[PDB]
Design a protein around this ligand. Structure first.
Ligand SMILES: C=C1/C(=C\C=C2/CCC[C@@]3(C)[C@H]2CC[C@@H]3[C@]2(C)C[C@H](CC(C)(C)O)CO2)C[C@@H](O)C[C@@H]1O
Length: 254
């Protein structure tokens, strides 16, 4: 019922997060041509044996994800309060949420026109088929696409988008966290900002239980995270796979 106005601090938090995102997410994807080139082998049959023997799209996608992890680290460092955490806790949070924030931020390039992550010409258009060419299976891809569509349909304001990523990163329920109380205090400040923003700036009927739906996406992400982890493990068993990855990727997912 009540719709309190955003406090000055809350307005500041949102401005800071919008700015952090604009500085770490290039909507033109102009750096992508610097990654190792994408290669698409003929795999109309979706052969696991062939996909693993080649891993043709892995070098490019690994570079894309490595690049993205670097951007997420930069984004996180700008989250109000993040710097108040110990170095040890900052790293724990980053490593555990990296893949989830990547899935979230990727929703910006995802398009329902053809269910792909379109980052430019045909060369930089990523489809389910490209993900399989990188060693992953439908067990991850299927729910990932469903997740992207579900997120797209929430029609989030950029303010809600950046707050969701911040809330995802600053989670007290990550294994290995030291000061969970502090992390939770920081997360609550962000969650309260999101709830307040939704209540006084998000017009209906898109505001109906929007917060609950957003929180459910965070739960969905935990599942996707676990499935990606299991599959990455399997992928890492392929001889010479490390050379197709990057040191940052090896560390975060290793
Ligand atoms: C990265 C970003 C973008 C798209 C995200 C995608 C499309 C390609 C496949 C990805 C990268 C998917 C998200 C997860 C999925 C995954 C399952 C991860 C996996 C990585 C590994 C092999 C190491 O296991 C390869 O496929 C583009 C832009 O919006 C920026 C955003 O930052």
């Amino acid at each position: 019922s009540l719709r309190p106005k955003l406090s000055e601090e809350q307005q500041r938090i949102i401005a800071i997060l919008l700015d952090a995102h604009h500085k770490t997410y290039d909507p033109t994807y102009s750096d992508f041509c610097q990654f190792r080139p994408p290669v698409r082998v003929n795999d109309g049959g979706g052969s696991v044996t062939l996909e693993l023997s080649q891993l043709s799209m892995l070098p490019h996608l690994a570079d894309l994800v490595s690049y993205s992890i670097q951007k997420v680290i930069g984004f996180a460092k700008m989250i109000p309060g993040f710097r108040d955490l110990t170095s040890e806790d900052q790293i724990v949070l980053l490593k555990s949420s990296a893949i989830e924030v990547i899935m979230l931020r990727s929703n910006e390039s995802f398009t329902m026109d053809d269910m792909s992550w379109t980052c430019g010409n045909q060369d930089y258009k990523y489809r389910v088929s490209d993900v399989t060419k990188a060693g992953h299976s439908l067990e991850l891809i299927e729910p990932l696409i469903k997740f992207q569509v579900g997120l797209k349909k929430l029609n989030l304001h950029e303010e809600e988008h950046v707050l969701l990523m911040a809330i995802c990163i600053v989670s007290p329920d990550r294994p290995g966290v030291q000061d969970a109380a502090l992390i939770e205090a920081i997360q609550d400040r962000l969650s309260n900002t999101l709830q307040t923003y939704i209540r006084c700036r998000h017009p209906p009927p898109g505001s109906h239980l929007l917060y609950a739906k957003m929180i459910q996406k965070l739960a969905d992400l935990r599942s996707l995270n676990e499935e990606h982890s299991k599959q990455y493990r399997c992928l890492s068993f392929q001889p010479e796979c490390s050379m197709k990855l990057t040191p940052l990727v090896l560390e975060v997912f290793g």
